[PDB]
Amino acid sequence: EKFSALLIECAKRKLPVVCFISSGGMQTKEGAAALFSMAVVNDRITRFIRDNELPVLMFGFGDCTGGAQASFVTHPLVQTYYLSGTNMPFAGQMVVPAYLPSTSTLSNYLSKVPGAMAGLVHNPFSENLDNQLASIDPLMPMPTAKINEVIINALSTLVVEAPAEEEEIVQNDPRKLMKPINKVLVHARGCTAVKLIRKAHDNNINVVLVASDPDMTAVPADMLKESDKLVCLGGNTSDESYLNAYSVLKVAEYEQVDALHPGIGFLSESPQFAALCVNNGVNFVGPSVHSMTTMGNKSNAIKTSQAQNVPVVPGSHGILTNAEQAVNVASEIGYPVLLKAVQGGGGKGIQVVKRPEDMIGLFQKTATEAAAAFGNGDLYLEKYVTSLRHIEVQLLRDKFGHAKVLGLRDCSVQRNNQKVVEESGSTMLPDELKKQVLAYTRALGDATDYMGAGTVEFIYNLDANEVYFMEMNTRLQVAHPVTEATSGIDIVSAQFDIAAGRSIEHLEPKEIGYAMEVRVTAEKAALDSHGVLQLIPNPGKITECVFPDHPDVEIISIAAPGKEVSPYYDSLIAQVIMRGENREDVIAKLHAYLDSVVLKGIATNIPLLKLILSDGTFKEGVYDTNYLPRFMAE
Amino acid sequence: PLFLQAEHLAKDFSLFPKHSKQSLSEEIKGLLNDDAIQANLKDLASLDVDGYVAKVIQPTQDKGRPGAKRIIADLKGRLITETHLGSFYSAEVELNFGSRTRRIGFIAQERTTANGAWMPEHHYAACKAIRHFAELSMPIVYLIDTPGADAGEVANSQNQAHSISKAIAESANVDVPTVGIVIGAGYSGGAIPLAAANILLSLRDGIFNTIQPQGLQSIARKYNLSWQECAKSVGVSPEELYTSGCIDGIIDFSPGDRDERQHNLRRAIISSIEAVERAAVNFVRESKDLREHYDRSLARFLNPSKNLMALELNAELAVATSPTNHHNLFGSAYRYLRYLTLRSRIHSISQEQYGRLSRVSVP
Amino acid sequence: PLFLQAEHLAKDFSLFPKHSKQSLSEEIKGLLNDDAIQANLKDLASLDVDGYVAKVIQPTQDKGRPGAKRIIADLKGRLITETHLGSFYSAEVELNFGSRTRRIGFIAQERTTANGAWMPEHHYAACKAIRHFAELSMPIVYLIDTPGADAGEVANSQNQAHSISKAIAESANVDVPTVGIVIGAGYSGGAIPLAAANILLSLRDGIFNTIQPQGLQSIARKYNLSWQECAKSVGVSPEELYTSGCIDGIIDFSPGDRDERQHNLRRAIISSIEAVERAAVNFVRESKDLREHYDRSLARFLNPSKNLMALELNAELAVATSPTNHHNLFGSAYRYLRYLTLRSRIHSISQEQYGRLSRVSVP
Numbered sequence A: 001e002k003f004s005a006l007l008i009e010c011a012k013r014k015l016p017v018v019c020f021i022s023s024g025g026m027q028t029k030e031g032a033a034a035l036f037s038m039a040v041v042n043d044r045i046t047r048f049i050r051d052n053e054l055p056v057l058m059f060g061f062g063d064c065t066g067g068a069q070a071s072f073v074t075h076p077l078v079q080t081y082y083l084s085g086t087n088m089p090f091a092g093q094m095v096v097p098a099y100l101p102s103t104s105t106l107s108n109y110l111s112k113v114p115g116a117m118a119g120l121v122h123n124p125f126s127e128n129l130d131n132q133l134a135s136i137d138p139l140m141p142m143p144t145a146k147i148n149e150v151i152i153n154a155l156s157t158l159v160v161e162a163p164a165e166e167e168e169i170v171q172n173d174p175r176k177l178m179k180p181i182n183k184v185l186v187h188a189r190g191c192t193a194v195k196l197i198r199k200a201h202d203n204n205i206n207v208v209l210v211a212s213d214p215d216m217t218a219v220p221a222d223m224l225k226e227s228d229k230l231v232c233l234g235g236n237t238s239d240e241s242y243l244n245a246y247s248v249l250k251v252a253e254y255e256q257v258d259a260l261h262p263g264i265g266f267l268s269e270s271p272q273f274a275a276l277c278v279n280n281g282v283n284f285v286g287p288s289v290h291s292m293t294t295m296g297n298k299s300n301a302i303k304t305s306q307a308q309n310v311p312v313v314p315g316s317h318g319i320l321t322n323a324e325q326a327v328n329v330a331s332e333i334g335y336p337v338l339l340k341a342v343q344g345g346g347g348k349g350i351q352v353v354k355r356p357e358d359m360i361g362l363f364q365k366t367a368t369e370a371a372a373a374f375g376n377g378d379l380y381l382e383k384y385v386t387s388l389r390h391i392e393v394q395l396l397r398d399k400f401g402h403a404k405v406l407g408l409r410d411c412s413v414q415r416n417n418q419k420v421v422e423e424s425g426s427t428m429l430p431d432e433l434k435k436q437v438l439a440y441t442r443a444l445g446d447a448t449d450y451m452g453a454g455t456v457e458f459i460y461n462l463d464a465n466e467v468y469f470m471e472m473n474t475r476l477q478v479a480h481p482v483t484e485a486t487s488g489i490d491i492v493s494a495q496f497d498i499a500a501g502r503s504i505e506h507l508e509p510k511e512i513g514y515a516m517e518v519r520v521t522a523e524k525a526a527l528d529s530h531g532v533l534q535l536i537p538n539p540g541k542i543t544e545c546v547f548p549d550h551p552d553v554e555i556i557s558i559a560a561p562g563k564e565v566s567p568y569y570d571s572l573i574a575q576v577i578m579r580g581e582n583r584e585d586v587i588a589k590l591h592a593y594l595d596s597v598v599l600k601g602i603a604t605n606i607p608l609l610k611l612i613l614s615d616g617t618f619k620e621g622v623y624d625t626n627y628l629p630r631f632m633a634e
Numbered sequence B, C: 001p002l003f004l005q006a007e008h009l010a011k012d013f014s015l016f017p018k019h020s021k022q023s024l025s026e027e028i029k030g031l032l033n034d035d036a037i038q039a040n041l042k043d044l045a046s047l048d049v050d051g052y053v054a055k056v057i058q059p060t061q062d063k064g065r066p067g068a069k070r071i072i073a074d075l076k077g078r079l080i081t082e083t084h085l086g087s088f089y090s091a092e093v094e095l096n097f098g099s100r101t102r103r104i105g106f107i108a109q110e111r112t113t114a115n116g117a118w119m120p121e122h123h124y125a126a127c128k129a130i131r132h133f134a135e136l137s138m139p140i141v142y143l144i145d146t147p148g149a150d151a152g153e154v155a156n157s158q159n160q161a162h163s164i165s166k167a168i169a170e171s172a173n174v175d176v177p178t179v180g181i182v183i184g185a186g187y188s189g190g191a192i193p194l195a196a197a198n199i200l201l202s203l204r205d206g207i208f209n210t211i212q213p214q215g216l217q218s219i220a221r222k223y224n225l226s227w228q229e230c231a232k233s234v235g236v237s238p239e240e241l242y243t244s245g246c247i248d249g250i251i252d253f254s255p256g257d258r259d260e261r262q263h264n265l266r267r268a269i270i271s272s273i274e275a276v277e278r279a280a281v282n283f284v285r286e287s288k289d290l291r292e293h294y295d296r297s298l299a300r301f302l303n304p305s306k307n308l309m310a311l312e313l314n315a316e317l318a319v320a321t322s323p324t325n326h327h328n329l330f331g332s333a334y335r336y337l338r339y340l341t342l343r344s345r346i347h348s349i350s351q352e353q354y355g356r357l358s359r360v361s362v363p
């Protein structure tokens, strides 16, 4: 890939190519896939001389063996050279069954053998080499040309075309593509698509919407105007529709869109999908690909946090190798502990391990969970904190470097890691630790050169009274309209300004009252095998659905009379975000509003939501992340 | 500028392998389905190293296994020419495509001479044969079967590397549909001029790998394994090669079968050549730059400029050796497609992308 | 457009034959020169009709004359395959051109059966061979030797009229160099699909006429002549056919020759085919409208409409039934140049160009 990239820079700028090649052969520890490098690089050198004419030199040095020797180095259009004393056989000592004479392997004896090289050159490092080789055999063929003589003769016989003014090594940079947006592709479905389609109207941008067959007649498609576009992706499930990145890019190219909003879920947080758009010159609304890989790779997110004096959640800090490694790091932290997948997220593959006796079997087990779920068995260890708050802090940042941190949220009422009752503040978090997580968000935002909207996640240990960085969301977070209310700053509009190339210096983050979000989901109550109450999805047609108009609540929704909730997608049917002066008032208004809200046809999670808002411990604000499954058993 | 475009497209198509249009594995009629491949992955996972060696490695080593000529004869077409030259076997057979008969070129590694181990003159014969089929517009089926090309003293004295570098150069730049089919073992630089095809297939019990599994013994000594452990760790079964994206499917045929499965080899060839030709026509429908590349290559045949004309004389390459034997516009499409598939078979990442290992609890 | 210009330039070529750019026979080695032919024109003028008939017509009445297969075999090329039924021969011989060896298709009227008289199934077999050589990028050499194609009751019941016109259509529009060579007698509808060439030659003792000399007997009865007198008056000699522009060259070769005149045959085929190829390369540099014709021809292959495709299916003609077996740009030069060649040796004049005969003292 580096050889193809270089021959491309040489074809663009009209450079002669010089190569110094030494190899033990093709890397066998890369699999059978490594062999194709012989034909890839050889084809790019065949095409480079046959389309661009510029001479390729191949100075074989050291040991020059295996597939590097057997392809591009000795290719019939290149000027093949060897340094004195170069070992040049088809394969090296690792593969060769028995001794090969220096007459058939050393470049000296091959110098006069026809078609072996255009010349044997002097080795300019080994001072006495040609006299050391003449003392071994005086009838050995000696080198004649220098590397400087071959290069000056190669350069001077060419036509000296007038050189253009120098450019840098041109790479994927969204900041160049960031131009004013009047038509945007929205890569989303559901409540996230309704949110982004609403923001597109509010910023005066036309939507190009893409959708699956159930979602062609969804509420985000109905919200579109005659000037907005809807395009069929086909199929029912995510695999047949939204996860086809080439179909979505081909729509971005066809409609000639000014930018692409990568949404939330699907391919939103993938640096591969960000790179795919920016390769083809399509502006990606969010951070740089560099910022996404630095804070998306879990080991490197911890190492960047360590460099910025931000405490991390204590663990292995890199990735674990084996079960013996997992036992030793777990013992140093103190049991119980966590095993997590690197390519995880959404609570998937997070195993708690209680003992060293358990860890030997539970490492092998959770490595199989990660390998089954993602195709990578890589575990990394973290300290299991039992009493915590999931605190998360919203960052905005432009290309100029203004790290406008909007405020925090507490998302501790959660069921199977999925957030349920989310808040604008934390009732157990000291103002000093709040100030520490605000400072750490700025340090990370500036030191990764982050752009767009992002959310850094913190564990706020209730037992220790400490805040620890866990990971980062390198995209838009579903909890965002809670912080839109309380910061006084619109997160998607600021992101659309940033992705238009504008500055966010002018913004003033506030702390306007309090806010809370309940995620309204289409789920029915049902008992488990021991008799503890669970919620599980209820698909079907909605017959009646009324959300009364109220000034201090925001409703993002896909539920309406005559619409169906699809079994191929999530039960999230609305986000109901209450605002108010104080926390008791926000809880009481949200409790009263949930009773004024009506849903029929489907079942909904609302019988549970009403009871959490009428709990005394929740009204006092005294809980942790494991509150909800305990409370559902009460 | 097609040279810049093919690295762009192949980088795009390697960012998400599954939903890419480089997936032609649905087209070929006579392959095993993805369910049988998943079931064979479960068996190879649950088996040990000896059970893996018995399933995968031992049938490709079998001396009773039908040779390249016997497999080509049991396509049941009409042979027009043959060239047996040691472990090289080129041929030319008319196959029925249903609408009419068609000349299909062959270049095969014959296991019944030197075990399929190629010498310098066999690579020079493969160079010549690849131009010869291009000059006559004949699609080529490559048949891969080798312990690797010879690393011996006679080979390197005859400049072995320099014959293979030309053979890969002709194969990469040939103006006809190329299909690879592994009929035994595809080891090292002897396997890659033939496996450099548009669509690389394998028979049900074939193998494709970086070197022969006994050559991993040096790396096994260095890290204290056996060479059999290193061979399973590398993952050399047709199922694992299809999972990694090295090959485009597993043909439901093994050289000794005599049931319904012997008919799958000609059917897989017919539907592969038809699939590459439909795909190449679709590329000429949508690429206006493929015209510009062809016109720039045509202008060199009209006016051969002295510096590249002298290079073509000394290099002896597959060029327009006549206006009649000059390639078509679709010829340049087979080069283009062949690069996109070869370049999406290779894969690399970055230092920022790679997940760092734990320094903690390491003596 | 090409079609409008193709008639115009060939119409301009018919105004002045002598200093035209169509003369390629000056560059071909193995022909009789102008000086040798002038001496024989004096001899043919000074001979009576009986001496003319013995020089020109009687050597093709030789029943022991070396056949069309045997003339191809004395090239001493490499035989790849031969197709033979009745008086139809076709072959595929890899001949050394000096620079390298090259496959050249041969299609031949063989005189050892029926004197060379082709039935409808031979014209359909010639069509099959003409399709194959177009698809497989092979130059054709036609050999003409026949009393004419069979015009009997079974021929017209089998629809000889459509079989002949299909063969003339496919030969006129074939996308490879065609070189006709009159090795004995060529007459009417049986000889004209094979005389539809980029260069048409003869041997030293051949004949080429509208119909056989003896078939002029019906016309001889009108004017009270012998059939022999009619053939001498219209001039069926290779020398008078060269002078009237019907043939490009008379090869200094008769089928029985055993000296260096047997070498002239091979040299004449090689330097005919290289001259036709050089002429196609020059015309591609000269013509922008040939480029536009290649685009329009290839664009209807990219988007085959039901009306266009349905007529092509009914006709079964030589067409691009594959992208790999689609013609190149020089194929479109061989169809264009073949038209110019055949069109410049027809002439016609207007009523004002014709001068009136005297009616004075003719009651």
Ligand SMILES: Nc1ncnc2c1ncn2[C@@H]1O[C@H](COP(=O)(O)OP(=O)(O)O)[C@@H](O)[C@H]1O
Residues within 6 Å of the ligand: A338, A344, A345, A346, A347, A348, A350, A382, A383, A384, A385, A386, A388, A389, A390, A414, A417, A457, A459, A470, A625
């Ligand atoms: N030991 C732990 N301490 C804190 N949280 C934990 C622990 N183990 C699992 N979790 C859950 O995972 C959260 C950390 O983020 P996570 O849920 O992995 O994010 P996502 O799945 O959305 O990427 C914690 O807030 C908690 O809900």
Ligand SMILES: [Mg+2]
Residues within 6 Å of the ligand: A457
């Ligand atoms: Mg989380």
